[PDB]
Design an enzyme around this catalytic site. Structure first.
Site, short mmCIF file in Angstrom:
data_model
loop_
_atom_site.label_atom_id
_atom_site.label_comp_id
_atom_site.label_asym_id
_atom_site.label_seq_id
_atom_site.Cartn_x
_atom_site.Cartn_y
_atom_site.Cartn_z
N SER A 148 0.86 -1.17 0.00
CA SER A 148 0.00 0.00 0.00
C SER A 148 0.90 1.24 0.00
CB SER A 148 -0.99 -0.03 1.16
OG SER A 148 -0.34 -0.29 2.39
N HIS A 196 -2.73 -6.76 2.41
CA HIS A 196 -1.78 -7.72 3.00
C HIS A 196 -2.36 -9.13 3.24
CE1 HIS A 196 0.58 -4.17 5.11
NE2 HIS A 196 0.56 -4.05 3.80
N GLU A 240 -4.21 -3.11 9.26
CA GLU A 240 -3.41 -3.63 10.38
C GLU A 240 -4.12 -3.47 11.71
OE1 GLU A 240 0.54 -1.90 10.23
OE2 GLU A 240 0.68 -2.14 8.03
N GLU A 268 2.36 -9.94 6.69
CA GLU A 268 3.16 -9.52 7.83
C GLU A 268 3.11 -10.49 9.02
OE1 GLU A 268 2.50 -5.39 8.72
OE2 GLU A 268 3.44 -4.75 6.83
N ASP A 304 -3.64 0.45 11.87
CA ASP A 304 -3.31 1.10 10.61
C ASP A 304 -4.43 0.82 9.63
OD1 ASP A 304 -2.39 2.21 8.27
OD2 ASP A 304 -0.69 0.88 8.04
N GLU A 356 -3.16 4.94 12.61
CA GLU A 356 -2.37 5.34 11.46
C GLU A 356 -3.24 5.46 10.20
OE1 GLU A 356 0.97 2.67 10.68
OE2 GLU A 356 0.95 3.23 8.57
N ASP A 395 1.38 8.16 7.63
CA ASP A 395 2.28 7.25 6.89
C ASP A 395 2.25 7.69 5.43
OD1 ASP A 395 3.67 5.13 5.68
OD2 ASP A 395 1.91 3.80 5.84
N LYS A 421 9.57 5.42 7.32
CA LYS A 421 9.91 4.39 6.34
C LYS A 421 11.06 4.88 5.47
CE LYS A 421 5.50 1.88 5.81
NZ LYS A 421 4.12 2.02 5.29
N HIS A 451 8.81 -1.28 9.21
CA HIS A 451 9.08 -2.15 8.05
C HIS A 451 8.21 -1.74 6.85
CE1 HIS A 451 5.57 -4.99 9.45
NE2 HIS A 451 5.25 -3.71 9.50
N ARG A 452 8.34 -2.46 5.73
CA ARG A 452 7.31 -2.50 4.70
C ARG A 452 6.69 -3.89 4.68
NH1 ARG A 452 7.14 2.13 1.52
NH2 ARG A 452 4.92 1.51 1.51
N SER A 453 5.57 -4.04 4.00
CA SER A 453 4.92 -5.35 3.95
C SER A 453 5.74 -6.36 3.10
CB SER A 453 3.48 -5.24 3.45
OG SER A 453 3.46 -4.77 2.11
N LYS A 493 7.11 -0.74 14.52
CA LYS A 493 6.27 -1.80 14.00
C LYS A 493 7.04 -2.56 12.92
CE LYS A 493 3.35 -0.07 10.32
NZ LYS A 493 2.04 0.37 9.80
#
Ligand SMILES: [Zn+2]
Ligand SMILES: [Zn+2]
Ligand SMILES: [Zn+2]
Ligand SMILES: [Zn+2]
Lengths: 431, 431
Positions: B42, B158, B167, B210, B245, B293, B320, B345, B373-375, B396
């Protein structure tokens, strides 16, 4: 003496399922060498001792503080000041420190991380990559990049579904480099997601423990046409073979002497070994199935021998729970002609020296060796170097999905790049 | 001059979804320093350029050979012989080499791996761990171990399910060490599996990108009681908070000016921003939800500002996609009081220097920083050191499941051990 082992330290870390495991650091003047221990879900009864705490207040009894304490307080102090190049000597020392046949005193999960990390410290002392050092220990004449066997539909104890058998794998046997093999595997994995989503719905495309899809499938025959469709759609018709891991001990009831093909469901689907034999014969005829692992219970040497003879030249039969990377069990398998491939799991036996002896024994008797992860893996990449070192041509280390699997595949890319364009790839009998 | 950058090399490797990404090695006399680039699913419209090949014959167009070539043929040769300690100087050089505002010429995914690997080579030259070197670059006065925010129910882009929002996280805010935080997170994750299995069936316990469970849930309110039940069952009542999120841009239709809460289904479930606002107010009242988020679309500064004011002191609002780790977008967010936490990020902006500037900017204006992180992740652990270095108290990096997530959590264990028992833990506002 400045060139010896300076420090040994163990710690509890998480594996890819969120369960505690053991990691060990060996420090020399050349640096810090870290190895982590994997952990199986469908663990054979003859595997070396995986030592856990049993404290219900920590990880509901799955802590590894005792194994870590054994590293820190027992094994570590014995290694300090020792020449890390003496792999066999130090492995044997740790065997004698434990003093039991199954590593039940110190834990195979205390011993193994030490064994691994020593070998990395040694490779560094020698000034060569790990795979080169291990190839020397093993007397390997020719390094090769292995064909990866990707477990892309997950079942058994590895997935949330009815599917009784554990692993449905694809292997790009006609790839001519590891780079190409990995890309092809990934491309098929991607077409497979779309095929599963269309057939089963989007709830069907989440992943099991080894990164394979976990569709709502009950029938063990049902994933196979789907694998062929995915191979076709990705543009790779004719380039792939199929590998199976039935993990059949997990379905076996000893008192009934039958296999339950719906052990994760309310009812009961009892089949005989003879019913399995003709399923396997039909599989081998109908698909390019080149390898079947643990087709029968772990003490069914007669069943094993029957199918090994029946599929000779077509499909290798892999001992995993049958052989548990253990020379004693392997000798029984050789005597009974029970199988013709070893699944090599370093933590089934618990030292690098013994795992190497197991590989050589099998190879000298004409078997293939497939180096393997466990379903509980870490960011550790040791088996990438090991498989190249053994020159076996076969690895199974997951679907091309989840970092505990991709870390191994990526390490194989790095090793391939170091070796150059004349490096051998694949398993010749499948090429 | 013997102490400078000797070699720079890029290569295509696989991320945790099986998609190609970029990894870079910087070689000095101190060793080989390797950093890999993550990749979002995303992805915000204002993120720096992730450069892909578009060759339908390789990974259906997702190859990173061009970004790798840019590392090997353009950036690498410019860095050879350069003093790796000059982080800002070299980051700025790469910005000027590219010459565009969005890193669209060379790729943020070529630039970032270089930026990361330079900083690791530098830390080695200085003789300190990465987190210590980065803390110096950032002027951080106090290191801390962060509270981990574990995405344990996966939705949106995800996961294979109807669940529109991305999330649903649990955070052991009342833990007093990172070791305890991680164990508690894992223990809850484990009780949650059993709770989901019982309620939804075993087909419901497979994992999303994730490592969170991907149950067949449509309603965005439905995971929350389940999280509370899991916390309770694990013996951790009162010790946990919830983080959300929404990734709400992914559900937003610009022409309708509405959010589709069933964008992964046949129909259409259109809701207004006002309908979301009262959902969020109800969430914050009914649960210990301490962070939300991207509650609105990435250009909805007015919506953002409204909820930020409404939940002030109770629930931080995290930019984000709104902020994309970019000082320019952050300045707009500050001016509009649109949010009060930055999701950091590194690959949204593409250099370490700029990511650090973004952190300092937000912190100087009274915001919190949650390193992320990223997914699409790798075995890379850079963000573990970065979050400690920034002393932000919030990370996270996934559910405690899948090696691309656990690699980060394990690195945090190692850093915690180095710092000792007097090392600070957690986010003070949540403790
Ligand atoms: Zn097994
Ligand atoms: Zn097996
Ligand atoms: Zn996103
Ligand atoms: Zn987000």
């Amino acid at each position: 003496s400045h060139m010896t082992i300076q420090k040994v330290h163990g710690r509890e870390v998480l594996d890819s399922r969120g369960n505690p495991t053991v990691e060990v650091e060996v420090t020399t003047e050349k640096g810090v060498f870290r190895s982590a221990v994997p952990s199986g879900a469908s663990t054979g009864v003859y595997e070396a001792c995986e030592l856990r705490d049993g404290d219900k207040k920590r990880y509901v009894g799955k802590g590894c503080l005792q194994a870590v304490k054994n590293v820190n307080e027992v094994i570590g102090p014995a290694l300090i000041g020792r020449d890390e190049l003496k792999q066999e000597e130090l492995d044997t020392l740790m065997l004698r420190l434990d003093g039991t046949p199954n590593k039940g005193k110190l834990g195979a999960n205390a011993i193994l991380g030490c064994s691994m990390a020593i070998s990395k410290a040694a490779a560094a002392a020698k000034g060569v990559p790990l795979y080169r050092y291990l190839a020397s220990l093993a007397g390997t004449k020719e390094l090769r990049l292995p064909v990866p066997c990707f477990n892309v539909i997950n079942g058994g104890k590895h997935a949330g579904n009815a599917l009784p058998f554990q692993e449905f794998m694809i292997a790009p046997v006609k790839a001519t480099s590891f780079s190409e093999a990995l890309r092809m595997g990934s491309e098929v994995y991607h077409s497979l997601r779309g095929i599963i989503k269309k057939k089963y719905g989007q709830d069907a495309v989440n992943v099991g423990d080894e990164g394979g899809f976990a569709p709502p499938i009950k029938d063990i025959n049902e994933p196979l046409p789907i694998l062929m469709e995915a191979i076709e759609e990705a543009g790779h018709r004719g380039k792939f073979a199929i590998c199976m891991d039935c993990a059949a001990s997990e379905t076996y009831d000893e008192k009934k002497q039958q296999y339950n093909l719906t052990f994760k469901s309310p009812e009961p689907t009892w089949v005989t070994a003879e019913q399995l034999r003709e399923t396997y014969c039909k599989w081998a005829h109908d698909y390019p199935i080149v390898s079947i692992e643990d087709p029968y219970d772990q003490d069914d040497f007669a069943g094993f021998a029957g199918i090994t003879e029946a599929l000779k030249g077509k499909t290798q039969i892999v001992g995993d729970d049958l052989t548990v990377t253990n020379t004693e069990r392997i000798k029984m398998a050789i005597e009974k002609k029970a199988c013709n491939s070893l699944l090599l799991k370093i933590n089934q036996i618990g030292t690098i020296s013994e795992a190497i002896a197991s590989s050589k024994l099998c190879m000298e008797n004409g078997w293939s060796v497939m180096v393997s992860h466990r379903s509980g893996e870490t960011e550790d990449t040791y088996i990438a170097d090991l498989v190249v070192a053994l020159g076996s041509g076969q690895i199974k280390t997951g679907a091309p999905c989840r970092g505990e699997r991709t870390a191994k595949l990526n390490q194989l890319l790095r090793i391939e790049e170091e070796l150059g364009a004349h490096a051998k790839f694949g398993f010749p009998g499948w090429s």
